Design a protein around this ligand. Structure first.
Ligand SMILES: CCc1cccc(-c2c(F)cccc2[C@](O)(CCCNC(=O)OC)[C@@H]2CCCN(C(=O)C[C@H](O)CN)C2)c1
Ligand SMILES: CCc1cccc(-c2c(F)cccc2[C@](O)(CCCNC(=O)OC)[C@@H]2CCCN(C(=O)C[C@H](O)CN)C2)c1
Ligand SMILES: CC(=O)N[C@@H]1[C@@H](O)[C@H](O)[C@@H](CO)O[C@H]1O
Length: 333
Protein backbone atom coordinates (compact mmCIF):
# COMPACT_ATOMS: atom_id res chain seq x y z
CA UNK A 1 0.00 0.00 0.00
CA UNK A 2 0.93 3.63 -0.65
CA UNK A 3 -1.03 4.96 2.33
CA UNK A 4 0.28 7.58 4.73
CA UNK A 5 -2.44 9.21 6.85
CA UNK A 6 -2.08 12.02 9.39
CA UNK A 7 -3.99 12.68 12.63
CA UNK A 8 -4.22 16.25 13.92
CA UNK A 9 -3.38 16.74 17.61
CA UNK A 10 -4.66 19.38 20.03
CA UNK A 11 -1.95 21.01 22.17
CA UNK A 12 -3.12 21.87 25.70
CA UNK A 13 -0.62 24.11 27.53
CA UNK A 14 2.37 22.17 26.13
CA UNK A 15 1.63 19.34 28.61
CA UNK A 16 -1.10 17.20 27.02
CA UNK A 17 -1.16 16.35 23.30
CA UNK A 18 -4.14 14.30 22.12
CA UNK A 19 -6.11 13.38 19.02
CA UNK A 20 -9.41 11.80 18.00
CA UNK A 21 -10.34 8.18 17.22
CA UNK A 22 -13.67 6.59 16.37
CA UNK A 23 -14.80 3.30 17.92
CA UNK A 24 -17.56 1.04 16.64
CA UNK A 25 -20.52 1.42 14.31
CA UNK A 26 -21.50 4.23 14.37
CA UNK A 27 -18.09 5.64 15.37
CA UNK A 28 -17.86 6.82 18.97
CA UNK A 29 -15.42 9.72 19.29
CA UNK A 30 -12.66 9.81 21.91
CA UNK A 31 -9.78 12.16 22.69
CA UNK A 32 -6.72 9.96 23.20
CA UNK A 33 -3.02 10.49 23.89
CA UNK A 34 -0.72 8.49 21.61
CA UNK A 35 1.86 7.02 23.97
CA UNK A 36 5.04 5.24 22.89
CA UNK A 37 5.58 4.24 26.54
CA UNK A 38 2.57 1.91 26.79
CA UNK A 39 1.29 -0.86 24.52
CA UNK A 40 -2.42 -0.89 25.47
CA UNK A 41 -5.37 1.07 24.08
CA UNK A 42 -8.06 1.96 26.61
CA UNK A 43 -10.98 4.36 26.98
CA UNK A 44 -13.53 5.11 29.71
CA UNK A 45 -16.48 2.73 29.85
CA UNK A 46 -20.21 3.31 30.22
CA UNK A 47 -20.10 0.57 32.88
CA UNK A 48 -17.80 2.78 34.98
CA UNK A 49 -19.43 3.76 38.25
CA UNK A 50 -20.26 7.45 38.57
CA UNK A 51 -18.53 7.33 41.98
CA UNK A 52 -15.37 7.87 39.93
CA UNK A 53 -15.62 11.53 38.94
CA UNK A 54 -13.41 11.12 35.87
CA UNK A 55 -16.06 8.92 34.25
CA UNK A 56 -18.54 11.77 34.69
CA UNK A 57 -16.28 14.45 33.19
CA UNK A 58 -14.98 12.36 30.26
CA UNK A 59 -16.66 10.61 27.36
CA UNK A 60 -17.72 7.00 27.88
CA UNK A 61 -17.85 4.05 25.49
CA UNK A 62 -21.24 2.32 25.25
CA UNK A 63 -20.79 -1.22 23.95
CA UNK A 64 -24.48 -1.77 23.17
CA UNK A 65 -24.52 1.25 20.83
CA UNK A 66 -22.10 -0.38 18.34
CA UNK A 67 -23.25 -3.21 16.08
CA UNK A 68 -19.61 -4.16 15.38
CA UNK A 69 -18.90 -4.57 19.10
CA UNK A 70 -17.72 -8.03 20.16
CA UNK A 71 -17.79 -9.03 23.82
CA UNK A 72 -14.67 -10.29 25.56
CA UNK A 73 -14.89 -9.33 29.23
CA UNK A 74 -11.47 -10.40 30.54
CA UNK A 75 -10.17 -8.40 33.49
CA UNK A 76 -7.45 -5.89 32.64
CA UNK A 77 -5.29 -3.76 34.94
CA UNK A 78 -2.78 -1.17 33.70
CA UNK A 79 -0.07 0.25 35.96
CA UNK A 80 1.47 3.68 35.42
CA UNK A 81 3.83 5.70 37.60
CA UNK A 82 0.76 7.60 38.83
CA UNK A 83 -1.40 4.64 39.80
CA UNK A 84 -3.68 1.98 38.36
CA UNK A 85 -6.67 1.80 36.03
CA UNK A 86 -8.94 -1.25 35.89
CA UNK A 87 -11.54 -2.58 33.49
CA UNK A 88 -12.30 -5.35 31.03
CA UNK A 89 -11.24 -6.18 27.49
CA UNK A 90 -13.45 -5.50 24.48
CA UNK A 91 -13.14 -5.65 20.69
CA UNK A 92 -14.54 -3.24 18.11
CA UNK A 93 -13.51 -1.39 14.95
CA UNK A 94 -11.25 1.60 15.63
CA UNK A 95 -10.75 4.43 13.13
CA UNK A 96 -7.54 6.47 13.23
CA UNK A 97 -7.02 8.93 10.41
CA UNK A 98 -8.04 7.19 7.20
CA UNK A 99 -7.27 3.72 8.61
CA UNK A 100 -9.75 1.33 10.23
CA UNK A 101 -8.80 -1.72 12.30
CA UNK A 102 -10.52 -4.33 14.44
CA UNK A 103 -8.80 -3.91 17.79
CA UNK A 104 -8.77 -5.40 21.28
CA UNK A 105 -8.88 -2.51 23.76
CA UNK A 106 -9.65 -2.00 27.43
CA UNK A 107 -12.91 -0.59 28.80
CA UNK A 108 -11.90 1.19 32.01
CA UNK A 109 -14.40 0.86 34.86
CA UNK A 110 -12.03 2.37 37.47
CA UNK A 111 -10.56 5.84 36.86
CA UNK A 112 -8.94 7.46 39.92
CA UNK A 113 -9.52 11.18 40.36
CA UNK A 114 -5.76 11.70 40.62
CA UNK A 115 -4.41 12.14 37.85
CA UNK A 116 -7.36 11.65 35.57
CA UNK A 117 -9.53 14.54 36.74
CA UNK A 118 -6.73 16.69 35.27
CA UNK A 119 -6.84 14.88 31.91
CA UNK A 120 -8.09 16.75 28.85
CA UNK A 121 -7.96 13.38 27.04
CA UNK A 122 -10.46 10.54 27.38
CA UNK A 123 -8.11 7.62 26.83
CA UNK A 124 -4.79 6.26 25.61
CA UNK A 125 -3.56 4.56 22.44
CA UNK A 126 -0.43 2.56 23.19
CA UNK A 127 2.19 2.78 20.43
CA UNK A 128 4.60 0.44 22.22
CA UNK A 129 5.48 -3.11 21.30
CA UNK A 130 3.42 -6.16 22.23
CA UNK A 131 6.23 -7.11 24.62
CA UNK A 132 4.94 -4.44 27.04
CA UNK A 133 1.24 -5.15 26.47
CA UNK A 134 -0.63 -6.30 29.57
CA UNK A 135 -2.51 -9.44 28.63
CA UNK A 136 -0.31 -9.81 25.53
CA UNK A 137 -3.03 -8.17 23.42
CA UNK A 138 -1.89 -7.17 19.95
CA UNK A 139 -1.10 -3.42 19.90
CA UNK A 140 -3.03 -1.23 17.49
CA UNK A 141 -0.02 -0.43 15.31
CA UNK A 142 0.78 -4.13 14.82
CA UNK A 143 -2.75 -4.69 13.52
CA UNK A 144 -2.14 -1.81 11.10
CA UNK A 145 1.05 -3.44 9.79
CA UNK A 146 -0.88 -6.65 9.16
CA UNK A 147 -3.22 -4.67 6.89
CA UNK A 148 -0.22 -3.84 4.68
CA UNK A 149 -1.82 -0.53 3.71
CA UNK A 150 1.03 1.64 5.01
CA UNK A 151 3.63 3.01 2.62
CA UNK A 152 6.17 2.19 5.34
CA UNK A 153 6.01 0.43 8.71
CA UNK A 154 7.13 3.61 10.52
CA UNK A 155 5.20 6.36 12.31
CA UNK A 156 6.30 9.82 13.41
CA UNK A 157 5.36 12.47 15.97
CA UNK A 158 5.27 16.27 15.84
CA UNK A 159 4.58 18.39 18.93
CA UNK A 160 4.27 22.16 18.59
CA UNK A 161 4.71 25.06 20.99
CA UNK A 162 1.48 26.45 22.43
CA UNK A 163 0.43 29.84 21.07
CA UNK A 164 -2.05 27.33 14.43
CA UNK A 165 -1.40 23.59 14.34
CA UNK A 166 -1.21 21.91 17.73
CA UNK A 167 0.55 18.74 16.66
CA UNK A 168 0.53 15.95 14.12
CA UNK A 169 1.22 12.21 14.04
CA UNK A 170 1.77 10.45 10.70
CA UNK A 171 1.17 6.72 10.21
CA UNK A 172 3.31 5.19 7.47
CA UNK A 173 5.88 7.97 7.13
CA UNK A 174 6.91 11.48 8.09
CA UNK A 175 5.82 14.92 6.94
CA UNK A 176 8.72 16.94 5.43
CA UNK A 177 6.77 20.14 6.14
CA UNK A 178 7.33 19.87 9.90
CA UNK A 179 11.02 18.87 9.91
CA UNK A 180 14.13 20.21 8.19
CA UNK A 181 17.30 18.50 7.06
CA UNK A 182 17.51 14.71 7.17
CA UNK A 183 16.70 12.21 9.90
CA UNK A 184 19.55 11.01 12.11
CA UNK A 185 18.68 7.45 13.09
CA UNK A 186 19.56 5.54 16.26
CA UNK A 187 18.96 1.83 16.81
CA UNK A 188 16.93 0.48 19.70
CA UNK A 189 18.88 -1.37 22.38
CA UNK A 190 16.33 -4.17 22.02
CA UNK A 191 12.91 -4.81 20.54
CA UNK A 192 9.85 -4.43 22.75
CA UNK A 193 10.45 -0.87 23.99
CA UNK A 194 11.29 2.43 22.34
CA UNK A 195 14.58 3.07 24.11
CA UNK A 196 18.06 4.05 22.95
CA UNK A 197 21.51 4.24 24.48
CA UNK A 198 22.45 7.71 25.73
CA UNK A 199 26.18 8.43 26.00
CA UNK A 200 25.83 11.22 28.56
CA UNK A 201 24.10 14.41 29.66
CA UNK A 202 25.67 17.88 29.61
CA UNK A 203 24.93 21.08 31.49
CA UNK A 204 26.67 23.83 29.55
CA UNK A 205 30.21 22.92 28.52
CA UNK A 206 30.85 19.93 30.81
CA UNK A 207 29.06 16.57 30.72
CA UNK A 208 28.03 16.10 34.35
CA UNK A 209 25.66 13.10 34.21
CA UNK A 210 25.18 9.70 32.58
CA UNK A 211 28.95 9.71 32.20
CA UNK A 212 29.29 5.97 31.51
CA UNK A 213 26.00 5.82 29.61
CA UNK A 214 22.36 5.36 30.54
CA UNK A 215 18.97 4.52 29.05
CA UNK A 216 16.71 6.97 27.21
CA UNK A 217 13.05 6.11 26.71
CA UNK A 218 11.48 8.24 23.97
CA UNK A 219 7.99 8.78 25.37
CA UNK A 220 5.27 10.56 23.40
CA UNK A 221 2.98 10.35 26.44
CA UNK A 222 5.54 11.97 28.74
CA UNK A 223 4.81 15.65 29.38
CA UNK A 224 8.29 16.51 30.73
CA UNK A 225 11.76 15.05 30.45
CA UNK A 226 12.34 12.80 33.46
CA UNK A 227 15.48 11.23 34.88
CA UNK A 228 16.28 9.19 37.95
CA UNK A 229 16.02 11.09 41.23
CA UNK A 230 19.80 10.83 41.62
CA UNK A 231 20.40 12.34 38.18
CA UNK A 232 17.78 15.09 38.50
CA UNK A 233 18.89 16.13 41.99
CA UNK A 234 22.35 16.82 40.56
CA UNK A 235 20.97 18.50 37.42
CA UNK A 236 18.77 20.96 39.30
CA UNK A 237 21.56 21.70 41.78
CA UNK A 238 23.76 22.65 38.82
CA UNK A 239 20.97 24.84 37.41
CA UNK A 240 20.28 26.40 40.80
CA UNK A 241 16.64 25.30 40.63
CA UNK A 242 14.58 24.87 43.80
CA UNK A 243 12.26 21.96 44.56
CA UNK A 244 8.58 22.61 45.26
CA UNK A 245 6.03 19.99 46.28
CA UNK A 246 5.37 19.15 42.61
CA UNK A 247 7.79 20.92 40.28
CA UNK A 248 11.26 22.42 40.16
CA UNK A 249 11.27 26.20 39.84
CA UNK A 250 13.69 29.06 39.25
CA UNK A 251 13.32 32.82 39.46
CA UNK A 252 11.55 33.72 36.24
CA UNK A 253 14.09 36.45 35.45
CA UNK A 254 17.00 34.00 35.68
CA UNK A 255 15.39 31.46 33.32
CA UNK A 256 16.79 32.85 30.05
CA UNK A 257 20.30 32.84 31.57
CA UNK A 258 20.25 29.16 32.55
CA UNK A 259 22.80 27.04 30.66
CA UNK A 260 21.94 24.71 27.82
CA UNK A 261 21.14 21.04 28.38
CA UNK A 262 22.47 18.59 25.80
CA UNK A 263 21.68 14.89 25.38
CA UNK A 264 24.30 12.89 23.49
CA UNK A 265 22.62 10.28 21.28
CA UNK A 266 24.16 8.31 18.43
CA UNK A 267 27.32 10.40 18.63
CA UNK A 268 25.43 13.68 18.11
CA UNK A 269 24.68 16.46 20.58
CA UNK A 270 20.98 17.23 21.10
CA UNK A 271 20.71 20.59 22.85
CA UNK A 272 17.77 22.23 24.64
CA UNK A 273 18.20 25.89 25.52
CA UNK A 274 16.59 27.40 28.61
CA UNK A 275 13.96 28.77 26.23
CA UNK A 276 13.07 25.17 25.35
CA UNK A 277 12.78 23.50 28.77
CA UNK A 278 11.46 26.43 30.87
CA UNK A 279 7.87 27.61 31.12
CA UNK A 280 8.06 31.42 31.09
CA UNK A 281 4.77 32.91 32.24
CA UNK A 282 6.52 36.10 33.36
CA UNK A 283 10.08 37.42 33.48
CA UNK A 284 9.58 39.04 36.90
CA UNK A 285 12.18 38.37 39.59
CA UNK A 286 9.30 38.20 42.11
CA UNK A 287 7.72 35.12 40.49
CA UNK A 288 8.84 31.50 40.15
CA UNK A 289 8.75 29.71 36.79
CA UNK A 290 8.26 25.97 36.37
CA UNK A 291 10.85 23.75 34.72
CA UNK A 292 9.86 21.17 32.13
CA UNK A 293 12.08 18.58 33.85
CA UNK A 294 11.51 16.53 36.99
CA UNK A 295 12.45 13.19 38.54
CA UNK A 296 10.63 9.91 37.91
CA UNK A 297 12.17 6.59 38.95
CA UNK A 298 11.07 3.98 36.42
CA UNK A 299 11.27 0.43 37.84
CA UNK A 300 13.05 -2.36 35.94
CA UNK A 301 13.03 -3.98 33.46
CA UNK A 302 12.28 -0.67 31.74
CA UNK A 303 14.23 1.46 34.22
CA UNK A 304 16.21 2.99 35.63
CA UNK A 305 15.98 5.18 32.54
CA UNK A 306 15.57 8.72 31.32
CA UNK A 307 12.32 9.64 29.59
CA UNK A 308 12.40 12.10 26.69
CA UNK A 309 8.93 13.60 26.60
CA UNK A 310 7.15 16.47 24.89
CA UNK A 311 9.91 18.82 26.04
CA UNK A 312 12.34 16.89 23.84
CA UNK A 313 9.94 15.99 21.02
CA UNK A 314 8.85 19.63 20.70
CA UNK A 315 12.25 20.66 19.32
CA UNK A 316 13.09 17.40 17.49
CA UNK A 317 10.65 15.77 15.08
CA UNK A 318 10.66 12.06 15.93
CA UNK A 319 10.23 9.12 13.56
CA UNK A 320 9.61 5.67 15.06
CA UNK A 321 10.73 2.84 12.76
CA UNK A 322 9.31 -0.65 13.37
CA UNK A 323 10.77 -2.36 10.30
CA UNK A 324 14.39 -1.41 11.05
CA UNK A 325 13.97 -1.03 14.85
CA UNK A 326 15.31 2.51 15.09
CA UNK A 327 14.32 6.06 16.01
CA UNK A 328 14.98 9.00 13.70
CA UNK A 329 15.51 12.58 14.83
CA UNK A 330 15.16 15.79 12.83
CA UNK A 331 15.00 19.47 13.74
CA UNK A 332 11.35 20.40 14.19
CA UNK A 333 9.76 23.35 12.42
C1 LIG B 1 -1.93 8.52 29.14
C2 LIG B 1 -0.67 8.91 29.83
C3 LIG B 1 -0.92 9.42 31.18
C4 LIG B 1 -0.95 8.57 32.27
C5 LIG B 1 -1.18 9.06 33.54
C6 LIG B 1 -1.40 10.41 33.75
C7 LIG B 1 -1.39 11.29 32.67
C8 LIG B 1 -1.61 12.75 32.87
C9 LIG B 1 -2.83 13.20 33.34
F1 LIG B 1 -3.79 12.28 33.59
C10 LIG B 1 -3.13 14.52 33.57
C11 LIG B 1 -2.14 15.46 33.31
C12 LIG B 1 -0.90 15.06 32.84
C13 LIG B 1 -0.60 13.72 32.63
C14 LIG B 1 0.79 13.32 32.09
O1 LIG B 1 1.70 14.40 32.35
C15 LIG B 1 0.82 13.05 30.57
C16 LIG B 1 -0.35 13.61 29.76
C17 LIG B 1 -0.42 13.01 28.38
N1 LIG B 1 0.87 12.99 27.72
C18 LIG B 1 1.16 13.82 26.71
O2 LIG B 1 0.34 14.47 26.10
O3 LIG B 1 2.48 13.83 26.46
C19 LIG B 1 2.89 14.66 25.35
C20 LIG B 1 1.54 12.25 33.03
C21 LIG B 1 1.77 12.69 34.48
C22 LIG B 1 2.53 11.64 35.29
C23 LIG B 1 3.78 11.19 34.55
N2 LIG B 1 3.46 10.82 33.17
C24 LIG B 1 3.72 9.60 32.65
O4 LIG B 1 4.25 8.72 33.31
C25 LIG B 1 3.34 9.33 31.20
C26 LIG B 1 4.12 8.17 30.62
O5 LIG B 1 5.41 8.64 30.23
C27 LIG B 1 3.47 7.68 29.30
N3 LIG B 1 2.81 6.37 29.39
C28 LIG B 1 2.83 11.94 32.46
C29 LIG B 1 -1.15 10.78 31.40
C1 LIG C 1 3.01 22.18 37.82
C2 LIG C 1 3.63 21.40 38.96
C3 LIG C 1 3.81 19.93 38.64
C4 LIG C 1 5.06 19.33 38.71
C5 LIG C 1 5.21 17.98 38.43
C6 LIG C 1 4.11 17.22 38.08
C7 LIG C 1 2.85 17.79 38.01
C8 LIG C 1 1.66 16.98 37.63
C9 LIG C 1 1.06 16.17 38.58
F1 LIG C 1 1.59 16.16 39.83
C10 LIG C 1 -0.04 15.39 38.33
C11 LIG C 1 -0.57 15.41 37.06
C12 LIG C 1 -0.01 16.20 36.07
C13 LIG C 1 1.10 17.00 36.33
C14 LIG C 1 1.71 17.87 35.21
O1 LIG C 1 0.99 17.62 34.00
C15 LIG C 1 3.19 17.53 34.93
C16 LIG C 1 3.54 16.04 34.95
C17 LIG C 1 4.95 15.73 34.51
N1 LIG C 1 5.00 14.56 33.63
C18 LIG C 1 6.15 13.96 33.31
O2 LIG C 1 7.24 14.31 33.71
O3 LIG C 1 5.96 12.91 32.50
C19 LIG C 1 7.15 12.18 32.14
C20 LIG C 1 1.28 19.41 35.39
C21 LIG C 1 -0.24 19.63 35.56
C22 LIG C 1 -0.62 21.10 35.53
C23 LIG C 1 -0.06 21.77 34.30
N2 LIG C 1 1.40 21.60 34.25
C24 LIG C 1 2.33 22.58 34.28
O4 LIG C 1 3.52 22.33 34.23
C25 LIG C 1 1.86 24.02 34.36
C26 LIG C 1 2.97 24.96 34.83
O5 LIG C 1 2.59 25.51 36.09
C27 LIG C 1 3.11 26.19 33.89
N3 LIG C 1 4.05 27.22 34.33
C28 LIG C 1 1.77 20.18 34.17
C29 LIG C 1 2.72 19.15 38.30
C1 LIG D 1 -15.02 -13.96 24.80
C2 LIG D 1 -13.63 -14.11 24.24
O1 LIG D 1 -13.41 -13.98 23.04
N1 LIG D 1 -12.66 -14.39 25.11
C3 LIG D 1 -11.27 -14.55 24.73
C4 LIG D 1 -10.73 -15.90 25.16
O2 LIG D 1 -11.54 -16.94 24.63
C5 LIG D 1 -9.30 -16.07 24.68
O3 LIG D 1 -8.76 -17.29 25.16
C6 LIG D 1 -8.43 -14.91 25.17
C7 LIG D 1 -7.07 -14.88 24.51
O4 LIG D 1 -6.67 -13.55 24.20
O5 LIG D 1 -9.04 -13.63 24.90
C8 LIG D 1 -10.41 -13.44 25.30
Amino acid sequence: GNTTSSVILTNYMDTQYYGEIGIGTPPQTFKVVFDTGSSNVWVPSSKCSRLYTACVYHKLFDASDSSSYKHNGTELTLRYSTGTVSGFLSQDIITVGGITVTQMFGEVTEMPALPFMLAEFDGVVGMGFIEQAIGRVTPIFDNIISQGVLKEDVFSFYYNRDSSLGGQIVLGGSDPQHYEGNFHYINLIKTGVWQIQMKGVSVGSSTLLCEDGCLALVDTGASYISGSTSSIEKLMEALGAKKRLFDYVVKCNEGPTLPDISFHLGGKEYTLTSADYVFQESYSSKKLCTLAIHAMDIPPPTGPTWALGATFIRKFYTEFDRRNNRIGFALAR
